[PDB]
Amino acid sequence: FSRVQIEHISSLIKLSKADVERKLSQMILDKKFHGILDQGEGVLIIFDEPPVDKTYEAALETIQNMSKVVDSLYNKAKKLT
């Protein structure tokens, strides 16, 4: 269950809320646990939007395509001088 209260999820894990909030947030620090907690109302919500794949393809192309035009700087600026 994504959205859950912190006190009764600490009742399922049988632990105090202080080190439940800090360990769960430590799991968010590890990125293995997708989600975040809420201290104000004592809520914990899980949400994810995994795929970056298209940005990886884009960046891989264009970032190297910089050096591509740098490689064309050699030939096309050689005919000038």
Next chain:
Amino acid sequence: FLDTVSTFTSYELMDYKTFVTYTVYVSMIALERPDLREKVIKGAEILEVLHSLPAVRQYLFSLYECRYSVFFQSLAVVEQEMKKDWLFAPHYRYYVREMRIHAYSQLLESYRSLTLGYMAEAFGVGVEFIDQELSRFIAAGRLHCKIDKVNEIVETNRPDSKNWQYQETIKKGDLLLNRVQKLSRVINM
């Protein structure tokens, strides 16, 4: 420098303790927090030579302890050692503000909506200090976030999963297509 103690001491390696300070000072920046404690705490051979000097060891275990009341004092001793060592002069200016965003990265990531009253519980004192401190660090470009007061909401954020996701296309494409626009319009004539 992951080899650590396997280099022992040599005339070309100068003082071995200085080499230990070189690797332990540089391992706190680009290394992840679980990877940081995996290097220093889980490392069997490196742990003793970093234990001999309490200055950096205090900064290592307090960084994992997350206490912010000893940070700038331990960073003062670390920075004082950073000033008097050669080749470290150009690199400390970014190294410090990087330790700000390093320690504040685990400060905000605790809760999406954080009550600054809970932050001010044990700080000594963080009521009005974290307001001007973190803000002036946000204005610089370190750990950008939107925090609210008198509503007592520190909202983290901003993932930047929309603009920055598609931004590299147009960003890189700006100078990319610019650099091909030069070579296109130069020749012929």
Next chain:
Amino acid sequence: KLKLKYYNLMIQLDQHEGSYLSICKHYRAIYDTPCIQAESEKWQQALKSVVLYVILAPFDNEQSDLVHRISGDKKLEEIPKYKDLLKLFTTMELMRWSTLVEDYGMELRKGSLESPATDVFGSTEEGEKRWKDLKNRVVEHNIRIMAKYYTRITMKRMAQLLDLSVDESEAFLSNLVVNKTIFAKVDRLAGIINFQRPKDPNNLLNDWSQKLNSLMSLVNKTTHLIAKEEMIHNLQ
């Protein structure tokens, strides 16, 4: 046919401690002995004992067609307890659990056949185990339809619909969600809890392939429209 009678010895071992699933097909194996009989009380008590263990076994895809194999027999419907047991299974909906206690509390006084009360309520600890199991099966039967219909629900309305406390709702929702049969969302403090839904790509499969799966019937509209049109126009 003594080897077929040894099954009645082995049902004590399979039903003894941890397996309510092993009695599924094996209680149908002991059911073949009354088929040769030439018996009355043991035959009729075999019909009820084999039809009343459906609650014992957990819900599974095999349990559906299982009770569908025994459903439809001319000898089985003679018992009103089978009418109630079938009433809750088919079409589901809702029935007060106290009424379920009324129909399942009279089976001790009912009989004729005492064998179902001997296997279920004959033992105190096993009877109580099947009381809480019955509670978990009827609340899971409620969750099964409700979860497919959520969307969302409220916590207080769940408490009055399930006829149990809110903490018992969280307990039954806890051991059902660790079974990963239904992925839920439960927050009691705000009062808004919800079950399902996909949780799909969803931008391609759900929105695209399903909408234009209805456009299959939209482009097939005129095709079968003119068909049935000509059908009713030709015969009269």
Next chain:
Amino acid sequence: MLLNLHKKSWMEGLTLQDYSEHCKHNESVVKEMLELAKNYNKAVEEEDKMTPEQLAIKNVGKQDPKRHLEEHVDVLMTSNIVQCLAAMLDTVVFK
């Protein structure tokens, strides 16, 4: 007519059905083959960015080109199927 009879293959079965079957699938599981096409984007174009640098090393064309040309332009022609047939939804849904 027998010309159009075999043209039912590449045109459409009824001249209506098969590309109304392209309105049946219609991006549906057709993004799965776009995911394999964008896997052909990553695959073919990660070795396509190695080509122009090598062209600067060997000075220049080895004749060549690898081809490694066109391709996903056709995937963008299926994107013309995406924009058109989905723009039909405004006509389908409204009246």
Next chain:
Amino acid sequence: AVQKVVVHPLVLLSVVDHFNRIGKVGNQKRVVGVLLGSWQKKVLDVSNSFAVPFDEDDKDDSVWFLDHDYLENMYGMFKKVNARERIVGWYHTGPKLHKNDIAINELMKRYCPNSVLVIIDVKPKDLGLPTEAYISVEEVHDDGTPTSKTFEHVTSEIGAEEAEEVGVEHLLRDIKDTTVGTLSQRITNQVHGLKGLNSKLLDIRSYLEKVATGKLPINHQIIYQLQDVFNLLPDVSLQEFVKAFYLKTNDQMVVVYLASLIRSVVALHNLINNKIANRDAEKKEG
């Protein structure tokens, strides 16, 4: 029963060339012959056929006859040379079947368990894939009338195997092939769209015309239910259909993003390499 049939161009031409046979002598009525089918599975396939001389009086519009000796020994001829071929039914050129066509199938039901009759069209005009397929079945009715036979429509598709592909694929010599990705899909957007407009138009014109003239009745064996199926989905937003909108917008994101990526790659390679070989050929020769 029979779901769909595969009509090759060979059987269609085998009816149409016989429409030239009796068409040069004329005059009225239609070309009727015996259909040779091939049943590998629930999907039906057609390979060969043969046509028999047929005449039908109008007087007496219900009178019909065929030559059984022609059906017998020629089936003995075609089964001999090809053991896979057998008669699955008969066929006629329509264009619209008169009520007498039922008894023809009822007579040849002794030859085949289920005889599917294929209406065909010798002159292509409208609206689409030619011919038609009707299977002989008894559906009775929901009104419980004494069982009567209204032939159910079987969807017909055109296909081939190997040699039948060779002949026609060379015989086209007409339009570009395909071409894939450019003209293909958009011309299909014209044909399937516009022929779908005039289809339901003329079909809804028959919906109102049959109510205006022709009653009884045709309203409503299926009129009330079929028309309500038209009223099933209007179907507009609010709400979730608004979510599908910008979700579809989020779907076009990736593909057009990839489009700009191919633009950068195609422009990079082609422009750089062409200008290289261009400036080099000019500076070396000049």
